[PDB]
């Protein structure tokens, strides 16, 4: 029953998920002046050429574009990571207004939305196992600002009318997630958590410095989705973001000077 409403939103989650008040919760504010360049950080290796998208699902909290992760087909390596992380899904968090929607903030700036490409550490065998480990997941976070359209996002936007409500899914094959990346792979990185229940502290966060731009029409279509199931009172899927959590005993590292 957790959600993003007045009565079940982020400030309530701790009652069912006590880890909500844990030592490495996400998202966080990225204070760019305090983040330290780490010369020992490697370039990110994003290898998405062999990606196999399968399906798009409205899960009542966001929509997931899901990939075949039964083989090393689309993987993230390098950067802060040891080993190989397989792409399982991507999704977004977004606002009711262009001035909010991102989970991470940059010097307190909120972006219109945030893309999360979720990967799991292959040494743990599958995703369910991986989320139980402190280095189980790597989530690549990419900010969205409103300006010019992102041509690579349009295929996602156009299928949304077919998954308007919670529990709806649609075939979604041959989608290339490379079309969602910015030019630069400069990043910040820190140890954190899932940003929704179960809020497990299993994520190495890698957040790209360069946002992608999407059009107002593209984000407007995100905002036409529903949190509710079909035949239930319409509640627009908007503001499905958790606010910044205390940094506590963590340092944010930068890949760039
Ligand atoms: N069972 C289960 C396992 C993991 C998640 C989950 C996965 C990724 C994220 S996020 N928003 O990418 O940090 C948040 C939650 C949700 C449900
Ligand atoms: Zn997310």
From Swiss-Prot:
Broad EC category: lyase
Activity dependence on pH, as recorded: Optimum pH is 6-8.
InterPro entries, alphabetized: CA_dom, CA_dom_sf, Carbonic_anhydrase_a-class, Carbonic_anhydrase_a-class_CS
Result, substituting residue 59 to H: Reduced proton transfer
Effect after changing residue 139 to F/Y: Strongly impaired activity
Membership in a protein family: Belongs to the alpha-carbonic anhydrase family.
Quaternary context: Interacts with SLC4A4. Interaction with SLC4A7 regulates SLC4A7 transporter activity. Interacts with SLC26A6 isoform 4 (via C-terminus cytoplasmic domain).
Full protein name: Carbonic anhydrase 2
Annotated organism of origin: Homo sapiens (Human)
Species lineage: Eukaryota, Metazoa, Chordata, Craniata, Vertebrata
């Amino acid at each position: 029953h957790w959600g993003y409403g007045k009565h079940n939103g982020p400030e309530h989650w701790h009652k069912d998920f006590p880890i909500a008040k844990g030592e490495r919760q996400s998202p966080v504010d990225i204070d760019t002046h305090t983040a330290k360049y780490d010369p020992s950080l490697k370039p990110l290796s994003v290898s998405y050429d062999q990606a196999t998208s399968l399906r798009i699902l409205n899960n009542g909290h966001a929509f997931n574009v899901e990939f075949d992760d039964s083989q090393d087909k689309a993987v993230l390596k390098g950067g802060p990571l040891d080993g190989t992380y397989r792409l399982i899904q991507f999704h977004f968090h977004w606002g009711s207004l262009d001035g909010q929607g991102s989970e991470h903030t940059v010097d307190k700036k909120k972006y219109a939305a945030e893309l999360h490409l979720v990967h799991w550490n292959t040494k743990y065998g599958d995703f369910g196992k991986a989320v139980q480990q402190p280095d189980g997941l790597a989530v690549l976070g990419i900010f969205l600002k409103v300006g010019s359209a992102k041509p690579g996002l349009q295929k996602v936007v156009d299928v949304l009318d077919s998954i308007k409500t919670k529990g709806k899914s649609a075939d979604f094959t041959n989608f290339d997630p490379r079309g969602l990346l910015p030019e630069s792979l400069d990043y910040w990185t820190y140890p954190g958590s899932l940003t929704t229940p179960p809020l497990l502290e299993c994520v190495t966060w890698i957040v790209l410095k360069e946002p992608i731009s999407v059009s107002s029409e593209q984000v407007l279509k995100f905002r036409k989705l529903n949190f509710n199931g079909e035949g239930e009172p319409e509640e627009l899927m908007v503001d499905n973001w958790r606010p910044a959590q205390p940094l506590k005993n963590r340092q944010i590292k930068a890949s760039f000077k």
